[PDB]
Amino acid sequence: RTLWTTPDTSPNCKIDQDKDSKLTLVLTKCGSQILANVSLIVVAGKYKIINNNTQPALKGFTIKLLFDENGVLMESSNLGKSYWNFRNENSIMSTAYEKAIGFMPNLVAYPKPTAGSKKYARDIVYGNIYLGGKPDQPVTIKTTFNQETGCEYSITFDFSWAKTYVNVEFETTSFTFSYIAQE
Amino acid sequence: KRTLWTTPDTSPNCKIDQDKDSKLTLVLTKCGSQILANVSLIVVAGKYKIINNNTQPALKGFTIKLLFDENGVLMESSNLGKSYWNFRNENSIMSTAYEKAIGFMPNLVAYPKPTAGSKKYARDIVYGNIYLGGKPDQPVTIKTTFNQETGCEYSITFDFSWAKTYVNVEFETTSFTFSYIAQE
Amino acid sequence: EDKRTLWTTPDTSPNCKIDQDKDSKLTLVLTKCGSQILANVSLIVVAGKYKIINNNTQPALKGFTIKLLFDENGVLMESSNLGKSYWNFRNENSIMSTAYEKAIGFMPNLVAYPKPTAGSKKYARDIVYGNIYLGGKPDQPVTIKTTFNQETGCEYSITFDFSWAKTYVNVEFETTSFTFSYIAQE
Amino acid sequence: EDKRTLWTTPDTSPNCKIDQDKDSKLTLVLTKCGSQILANVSLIVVAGKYKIINNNTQPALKGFTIKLLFDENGVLMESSNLGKSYWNFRNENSIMSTAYEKAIGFMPNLVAYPKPTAGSKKYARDIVYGNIYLGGKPDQPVTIKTTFNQETGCEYSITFDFSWAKTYVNVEFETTSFTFSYIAQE
Amino acid sequence: KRTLWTTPDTSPNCKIDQDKDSKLTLVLTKCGSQILANVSLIVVAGKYKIINNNTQPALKGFTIKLLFDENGVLMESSNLGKSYWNFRNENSIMSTAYEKAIGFMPNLVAYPKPTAGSKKYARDIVYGNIYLGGKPDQPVTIKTTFNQETGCEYSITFDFSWAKTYVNVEFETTSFTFSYIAQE
Amino acid sequence: DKRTLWTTPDTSPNCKIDQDKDSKLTLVLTKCGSQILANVSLIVVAGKYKIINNNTQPALKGFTIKLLFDENGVLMESSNLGKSYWNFRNENSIMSTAYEKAIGFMPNLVAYPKPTAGSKKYARDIVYGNIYLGGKPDQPVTIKTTFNQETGCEYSITFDFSWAKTYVNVEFETTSFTFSYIAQE
Amino acid sequence: DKRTLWTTPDTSPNCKIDQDKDSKLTLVLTKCGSQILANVSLIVVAGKYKIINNNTQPALKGFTIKLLFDENGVLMESSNLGKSYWNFRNENSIMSTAYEKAIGFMPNLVAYPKPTAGSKKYARDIVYGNIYLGGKPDQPVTIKTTFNQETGCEYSITFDFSWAKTYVNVEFETTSFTFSYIAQE
Amino acid sequence: KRTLWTTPDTSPNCKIDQDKDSKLTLVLTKCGSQILANVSLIVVAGKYKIINNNTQPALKGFTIKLLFDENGVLMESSNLGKSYWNFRNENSIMSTAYEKAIGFMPNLVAYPKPTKKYARDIVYGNIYLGGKPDQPVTIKTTFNQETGCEYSITFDFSWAKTYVNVEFETTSFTFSYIAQE
Structure with a gap:
């Protein structure tokens, strides 16, 4: 009932370069809603340290999870496939999972955007998370469901x-949100 | 069933100012002693569709009320229409109206009905923000209050x-997610 | 008996010591959703120095802490601010009459949220920020900062600052009220 | 040395057990005015079952009793709810340096207020009613009923219900606070 | 002597809203550790003389304060006039103003001044009722508070x-009788 | 300068808040025809109000300075401000002889009537301001000025x-704080 | 009444800090009328407190040993100290019969009352001292002794x-460290 | 008896600044040639009750003196009140004032009166405010250094x-001293 990244500090995600970050993402299926918990550590590279004196235009970045028709994470995602599976103890299942459609964002609630059709904001959830745990260091985490092409479903973190x-x-x-499940 | 919802399409189901002027998308998923709630709103017509506070400076908020009887059944005075509110069946709703949903109602000990002289605590409120057009600089406050309406046994009010x-x-x-303590 | 919910009974009676015995009601409901605990919290201060805030007369009175410390079995330790007789598995609108022996499934995960270390970088993942509002007024926010497994003298902890x-x-x-979730130990 | 006032001292340090040890400060001042004792009383509950009244959660919690039982010399007996340590004749804002041995002139008169006895007519004149107000608020009355010489296992008694x-x-x-008087034994 | 009083005549001695609009009759008799107090009030002029809450709905109470210095001497800032307040001499007062009356002051351990970080207990208040015109259906609350005013060492406040x-x-x-614990 | 009544701008004490000469009230009243332009500040040099400690005295949160005037606008001895220090300007001092008339500096009695039983008391006779202790922006004090509310005088200015x-x-x-008021003539 | 209650002075472990019998508490209580003269030292023989390394275990900065007594002054089994060799002195060992009464060795309940909710306790019931690890003058640890602070007993001595x-x-x-306390009788 | 004390309740018995502002709990137990002493202090009122050295930077100490006559009787000039100082009786004091306690007095050969001053008539200790280990106060005890008495114990x-x-x-703090007899 839970798809997750093992919540240690080892890197699992490429924002700019391989293994530059640890996305900790836990999706727990509560029937028709997925309860989601997320945090991020950037361990290396361009996004490890924000310095807007030296890089005044660096004001954000994006992590995308792209899923196929069976809810399987695609290699085009920023998150690495070997790091993403159903929970087993404090680790992950040994065999890669074959189906997770019940964890996917519902395509009626959150349709793929289509040229010529009105795009509603219901497919976004906003939150804040705090750098270094300091209450005066907010960043915006914008999560969008089923925005991406090249996939059947997607979760995008801006x-x-x-x-x-x-x-x-x-x-x-850390931040918690939920979304409507496909089935 | 463990989810009560409005079908998550875009067809209007709610009256804010005029009939069918809005689509309230509300999903209540029972997690035992808590209901996990997810909500968003589309206004499709009427005076709240396009906000212009230069021409209408007083247009600064509105209310959507869900009132429930002793069986957890939605009452017709609610802003949300009854024919749109039922247990989930695939991406739609059960074809027959439900008869009991007390397990989805806000707990009356946690969130009592008002009575004169009774000390009123703020635990029965949850605050959140949602964003117009998905834009981060267009917040609106969504204030959710449990069991504060009269003429009903239970209520969920969105201000x-x-x-x-x-x-x-x-x-x-x-969209915004919250939870509340369930009646049973 | 609802072994999926640990809670304080959702009545208004005091159960918690911020400064003195029975000076507050912490309403806390932990609902196990497999590997995540769905948590709902609010606070009523019923007496003592934190009941009525006046920062004109007490400018330094700007916060306080409520700690839940747990042993290796997930049992609440007496050093916690929350009283032990008030904290148990749910039974209808009350609690079970005998004290629980194990609740490790409700504890914050130690790999996600490690105890303080001798020499390692401490990451912020073990914190959740929220706001709650005094008197239900939208212009009276308070920050509720929740931290997992950062107290000493226990095996697990939940701290509300x-x-x-x-x-x-x-x-x-x-x-x-405020809702959050955290990753469960098992 | 003021042998015309017997008191608890006027500080706020708990001296009384309603439900648990030292859960309350009973402030009681008995001043001898010849044939009447002028009495002044208030109560602070600092802990335990009666500190915070919540009749939504405990609708049957509607009263309690504090008893002062005295021997044939007017000495407070250890079976009283009030402790003996600081019940003594006045010395400034404290008590005399040794425990008193005799205070019969402070005891309620046994002819006016006889002890209960087998099949004898009990008259109400051994009672005085008053009200006091919780938190000083005029809409929070409680009844204080004081009865003289109705307890067993003593020679004299003052009971506060x-x-x-x-x-x-x-x-x-x-x-x-509330003031009353009663007829003195001698 | 043992009694501080206002002579019990009917001569105005007090300012509620305007000078000499009232006669406070107050008798304090020292009984060792307790002061036995007896009080009544006559309003002789001004807006509080005849109450009409149909036409003046906000006219619902007023305060008379007695403020004393470190020697127990009544301070001029009190509502009660100083020339009216002294030890008893027959049915009048001593001709020379008294210099010390600490034995008549409310005890500061029983009834402390406001103190930073100290809990304020209600035991420094006594409530009573008195009756307008002697009629049993015309109660008014007389609240007496000890040592809560500023600008003094001791105080008695009647609300x-x-x-x-x-x-x-x-x-x-x-009239109403009460007592309080004496300072010495 | 018959157009200015003032205390002079030096720092020698001229006022009794709690004890004699415990404070310097600096008050300048400049007549601009029908309005008096007023500028005020306060220095407490001694006594109970010199150093505020609301840890020691939590309830000590205010005090009052009253100026009472007779029917000729002459300051009365019952005022907190001393008469020796209050006169028309001459350079940075005051005139030698005590003034005899200053009705043109008095608060207007129609705008600001004496209170009387049975008459509505309007708030027009008050002006609120703030001043700051030690010049620090986080140490505000409210200065409330009320005209013609005191008894035992023909006119008054009260600073609470x-x-x-x-x-x-x-x-x-x-x-310092500046305000104005309507002049009697 | 010049008697002594003691642990015996050998080095056989008699006390649990973290695991059974991981320490020898050497405690000697000698009745000097109204005061008990006390002498204490501690040897940790096993377990996690035997060798302290606060570079690697920085949270290992203290521990507690409790002696709980019943109404007769008899050591309760809930104490960290074991009962077998806690008795009146006989030569370098203990009396052959287990003692039945030692109220004269108990900390005075008037001087040192049981703490109760809603009463701020006084510090009179504490004595501080230092003892030195390995006898080295630059290795102090604090020994804080508190009388009658524990529940579930009539009297107690707590070493933090x-x-x-x-x-x-x-x-x-x-x-070793010496202190005294006021005796119950 | 073998113990002179103040009843170890919380009632005040001492004037530092003002009457009855403090409770000195002092127990002197005769062990032959040495007196075993145990002391603590509670300030209940007056200027030393709450220390605020931000407002009162020079408030850094005070003295409590016990002066005794040739019979070891406490003199009224002492800071401790005579009503409170006597031989122990159960958990209180004897009701009749004692007449002789020379065996409790500090030895005059060990600790001579002012009229070569050696430091051996002093014992230093620390006690802790509020029981907090980071709130030390020095308690300096001096024997037989006051005038106008035969013997004295001074606490600075x-x-x-x-x-x-x-x-x-x-x-609390424990010390001992050599007894006069």
């Missing part, structure tokens, strides 16, 4: 900030 | 409000 |  |  | 209030 | 000083 | 050991 | 830290 942060490490508090 | 002066902004929102 | 920046003048400390 | 009719919700039990 | 709607009722009262 | 915040070892000496 | 310094591979075996 | 309390809103109520 992180952004308006403040000028100077040498602030990108490692965050 | 929407905003402080900013919105000019030519369509009222269709991002 | 309440704080505010505004100068509140004769404002009663009784709050709206 | 507290009761209320209203449904109090999270009201701290600490009271305004 | 009068009423919930009933009195219609053309003269404010002149029955 | 109050504060809400707990000040701990804060000297009571203030910034 | 704690240290501020970061000890690196230092064995927990201590010098 | 002092501290170096800047304490802010700290209540002066202490842990």
Whole structure:
């Protein structure tokens, strides 16, 4: 009933370069809703340290999870496939999973955008998370369901900030949300 | 069934100011002693569809009320229409109206009905924000209150409000999740 | 008997010591959804120095802490601010009459949220921020910061740090509710 | 040395057991005015079952009793709810440096207020009723009923029965003061 | 001597709203560790003389304060006039103003001044009722509070209030007795 | 300068808040025809109000300075401000002889009537302002000025000083505030 | 009544800190009328407190040993100290019969009342001292002794050991400390 | 008896600044040639009750003196009140004032009166405010250094830290001294 990344600190995600980040994502199926819990540690590379004195235009970045028609994570995702599976103890199942359609965002609630059709905001959930656990260091985490092409379903995390942060490490508090499940 | 919902399509099901002027998308999923709730709103017509606080400076909020009888059945005075509200069946709703859903009602010990002279605590409220047009600089407050309406056994009230002066902004929102303690 | 919910009974009676015996009602409901605990919390201060906030007369009174400390079996330790007789598995609108022996399935996961270490980087993943509102008023926010497994002298812990920046003048400390979740130990 | 006042001292340090040890400060001052004792009383509950009244959760919790039992010399007996440590003749704002041995002139008169006895007519004149107010609020009355010489296992007694009719919700039990008098034994 | 009083005549001695609008009759008799107090009030002029809450709905109470210095001497800031307050001499007062009356002051351990970080207990209040015109259906609350005023070492504050709607009722009262713990 | 009544701008004490000469009220009244332009500040040099400690005295949160005038606008001895220090300007001092008339500086009695039983009391006779202890922006004090509300005089100006915040070892000496009022003639 | 209650002075473990019999508490209580003269030291023989390394275990900074007594002054089994060799002195061992009464050795309940909710307790019931690990003068630890603070007993003596310094591979075996306390009778 | 004491309840018995502002709990137990002494202090009122060295930076100590006559009887000039100091009787004091207690007095050969001053007539200790290990106060006890008496015990309390809103109520300290007889 839970798809997750093992919640240690080892990297599992490429924002800019391989293994530059640890996305901790836990999806628990509560029938018609998925209860989601997320946090991010950027361990290396371009996004490890936000410095808007030296890089004034660096105000955000994106992580995409793309899923096929069986709810299987696609290699085009920023999150690595070997890191994503049903929970087993404090680790993951040995064999890669074959179906997880019940964990996918519902396509009627959150349709793929279509040219010529009105796009509603119901497919977005906003939250904040806090860099370094400090209450004066918010960033926006914008989560969008089924926005991407090249997939049957998707979850997209857009992180952004308006403040000028100077040498602030990108490692965050946790946020919980939910979404309507496909089945 | 463990989920009561409005079918998550876009067809209007709610009256804010005029009949069928909005689509309230509300999903209540029973997790034992808590209901996990997910809500968003699309206004499709009427005075709240396009907010212009230069021409209508007083247009700063509105209310959507769900009132329930002793069996957890939606009452017709609610802003949400009854024919749209039922247990989930695939991506639609059961064909026959439900008779009991007390397990989805807000707990009356946690959230008592008002009585004169009774000390009223704020535990029966949850605050959140949702965002018009998906834009991060267009927040609206969604205040949810449990069991504060009269003429019903249980209630969920959504009060929407905003402080900013919105000019030519369509009222269709991002989603928000909350929970509340279940009656049984 | 509802072994999927640990809670304080959702009545209004006090169950918690912030400063003195029975000075507050922490309403806390932990509902196990497999590997995540769905948590719902509010606070009523019924007496003592935190009941009525006046920052004109007490400018330094800007926050306080409520700690839940648990042993290796998930049993609440007496050093916690919440009283042990008030904390148990649900039975209808009350609690089971005998004290529970095990609740590890409700504890915050130690790999996700490790105890303090001798020499390793401490990450912020073990914190959740929220706001709650005094008197239900939208202009009276308080920060509720929840931290997992950062207390010593226990095997697991949940710490609620309440704080505010505004100068509140004769404002009663009784709050709206907040929901969050955390990763479960098993 | 003021042998015309017997008191608890006027501090707020708990001296009384209603339900648990030292859960309350009974402030009681008995001043001898010849044939009458002028009495002044208030109560602060600091802990335990009666600190915070919540009649939504405990609708049957509507009163309690504090008994002072005295021997043939007017000495307070250990079976009393009030402790002996600081019940003594006045010395400034404290008590005399040794325990008193005789205070019959402070005892309620046995002809006016006889002890209960087998099949004898009990008259109400051994009672005085009053009200005191929780938290100083005029809408939070409680009844204080004082009865003289009705307890067993003593030669004299003063019994305070507290009761209320209203449904109090999270009201701290600490009271305004009340004055009464009674006829002295000698 | 053993009694501080206002002479029990009917000569106005007190300012509620305007000078000499009332006669407070107050007798404090020292009984060792307790002061036995007896009080009544006559309003002789001004807006509190005849109460009409149909036409003046906000006229629901007023305060008379006695403030004392470190020697127990009444301070000029009190509502009660100083020339009216002294030790008893027959049915009048001593001709020379008293210099010390600490034995008549409310005890500061029983009834402390406001203190930072100290809980304020209600035991520094005594409630009573007195009756307008001697009529049993015309109660007013007399609340007496010890040592809660600023600008003094000791204080006795009388707050009068009423919930009933009195219609053309003269404010002149029955008497009430209470006691309080003495400072020395 | 028959157009200015003032206390002079020096710092020698001229006022009794709690004890004699415990404070310097600096008050300048400049007649602009039908309006008096007023500028005020306060320095407490001694006594109970010199150093505020609301940890020691939590309930000490205000005090009053009254100026009472007779029917000729002459300051009465019952005022908190001393008469020696109050006169028309001459350079940075005051005139030698005490003034005899200053009705043109008195608060207008129609705008600001004396209170009387049975007459409505309007708030027009009050002006609120703030001043700041030690010049610090986070140490406000309210200065409430009321015209013609005192008894035993023909005209009055009352300054009620109050504060809400707990000040701990804060000297009571203030910034300045300007206001105006309607002149009797 | 010049008697002594003691643990015997050998080094056989008699006390649990973290695991059974991981320490020797050497405790000697000698009745000097109204005061008990007390002498204490501690040897940790096994377990996690035997060798302190606060670089690797920085949270290992203190521990507690409780002696709980019934209404007769008899040591209760719930104590950290075992009952077998806690008795009146006989030579370098203990009397052959287990004692039945030792109220004269109990901490006075008037001087040192049981704490109760809603009463702020006084510090009079504490004595602080230092003892030194390995006899080295730069290795202090605090021994805080509190009388009658525990529930589930009539009387109690609690030893709380704690240290501020970061000890690196230092064995927990201590010098001796003497104190006194007021006796119940 | 073998113990002179103050009843170890919380009732005040001592004037530091003002009458009845403090409870000195002092127990002197005769062990032959040595007196075993146990002391603590609770300030209940007045200027030393709450130390705030931000407001009162020079408030850094005070003294409590016990002066005795040739019979070891406490003199009224002492800070401790005579009503409170007597031989022990159960958990209180004897009701009749004692007449002789020379065996409890500090030895005059070990500790001579002012009229070569050696430091051996002093014992130093620390006690802790509120029982907190970071709130030490020095308690200096001096024998037979006051004038106008035959014997004396003087307690000088002092501290170096800047304490802010700290209540002066202490842990206990034990010492001994050589007895006069």
